[PDB]
């Protein structure tokens, strides 16, 4: 799923001193039902012990599309733009 939270820019912890705010959206939730043939193979290759399975992992709920650019003016009268910072759409990739 897609989820939204209203935040100060300083809450983003990106090193900005300012009073400006934003809406930030993120992808969260379980989504590991082994959709593709590749992901079916991984579940099976682990169940029959064949892999050994060091750090192999299946699909993740990640962002597929990103929102508009967000601007702000800091306490020092310098502008900044955040790009690819908030999710628009979510999928298992």
């Amino acid at each position: 799923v897609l989820t939204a939270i209203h935040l100060n820019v300083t809450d983003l912890g990106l090193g900005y001193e300012t009073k400006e705010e934003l809406i930030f959206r993120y992808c969260s939730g379980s989504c590991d039902a082994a959709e593709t043939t590749y992901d079916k193979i991984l579940k099976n290759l682990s169940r029959n012990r064949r892999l050994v399975s060091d750090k192999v992992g299946q699909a993740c709920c990640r962002p597929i599309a990103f929102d508009d650019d967000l601007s702000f003016l800091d306490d020092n009268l310098v502008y900044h733009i955040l790009r690819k910072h908030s999710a628009k759409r979510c999928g298992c990739i």
Partner: protein, 284 residues
């Protein structure tokens, strides 16, 4: 796509009759080719009248629209021939803008080209100006005006307000030209001449013998003022203290026309109608 005045003349050119009528009008009528005071027709007044009338029922007489981007001046030449001649309120605006899809989208669409990544790099002024015009064209008065015309109580607020248009890129220039020459230079371009005239129209005194305007004039003034931003005639607050505004010009070396230059400049720098309209937006 829509040329406007130029396109219409092209239509006129297509037919022989219309072209001839246009030729006669140009020959007979001064239009705005000469000084108005001179307004001496090339031939005689009667001939100009006939030529003018001759245009009726032709494609010609057109209104000149701004849309002629590159060739504003050419359009303007035509068309004129006929026509004549910290908490704070600026912070709440920046908050409201970002929390809105249209404003956040269009705020950054202009901050992007108006700012530079490194100290001694330089912005593209035309990209910054175009995006500025886009911003006030596409974002409703509500959010667009809150940025520019917010009331303040302290310097953190005023310094923020003055930065709205990214002056370093969009306002300031190495040399400050004379105000009357830049007026001339503004009147060449279709966009500026269109936006400058609305300013002079909308932000003029009551038209009694008082040097103040009315409340019903307020909205039209702020629109006309905001429309100047992104043109050669871009205005900004001159300091971080008052509501006094001005283009990037002064009245040095005005020669014999010093009276007229300061008069033009005080229409920006000491405009009571503008002052009141700005104050009304973010006060009551």
């Amino acid at each position: 796509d829509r040329l406007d005045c130029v396109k219409a003349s092209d239509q006129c050119l297509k037919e022989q009759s219309c072209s001839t009528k246009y030729r006669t009008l140009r020959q007979c009528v001064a239009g705005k080719e000469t000084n108005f005071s001179l307004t001496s027709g090339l031939e005689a007044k009667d001939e100009c009248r006939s030529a003018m009338e001759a245009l009726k029922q032709k494609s010609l007489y057109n209104c000149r629209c701004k849309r002629g981007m590159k060739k504003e001046k050419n359009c303007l030449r035509i068309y004129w021939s006929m026509y004549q001649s910290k908490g704070n309120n600026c912070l709440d605006a920046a908050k409201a803008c970002n929390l809105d899809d249209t404003c956040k989208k269009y705020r950054s669409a202009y901050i992007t080209p108006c700012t530079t990544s490194m100290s001694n790099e330089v912005c593209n002024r035309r990209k910054c100006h175009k995006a500025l015009r886009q911003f006030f064209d596409k974002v409703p008065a509500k959010h667009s005006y809150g940025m520019l015309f917010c009331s303040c109580r302290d310097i953190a607020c005023t310094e923020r307000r003055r930065q709205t248009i990214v002056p370093v890129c969009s306002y300031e220039e190495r040399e400050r030209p004379n105000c009357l020459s830049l007026q001339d230079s503004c009147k060449t371009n279709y966009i500026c001449r269109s936006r400058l005239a609305d300013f002079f129209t909308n932000c003029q005194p009551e038209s009694r013998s008082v040097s103040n305007c009315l409340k019903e004039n307020y909205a039209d003034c702020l629109l006309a003022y905001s429309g100047l931003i992104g043109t050669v005639m871009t205005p900004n607050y001159v300091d971080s203290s008052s509501l006094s505004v001005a283009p990037w010009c002064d009245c040095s070396n005005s020669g014999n026309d010093l009276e007229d230059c300061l008069k033009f400049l005080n229409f920006f720098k000491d405009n009571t109608c503008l002052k009141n309209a700005i104050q009304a937006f973010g006060n009551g």
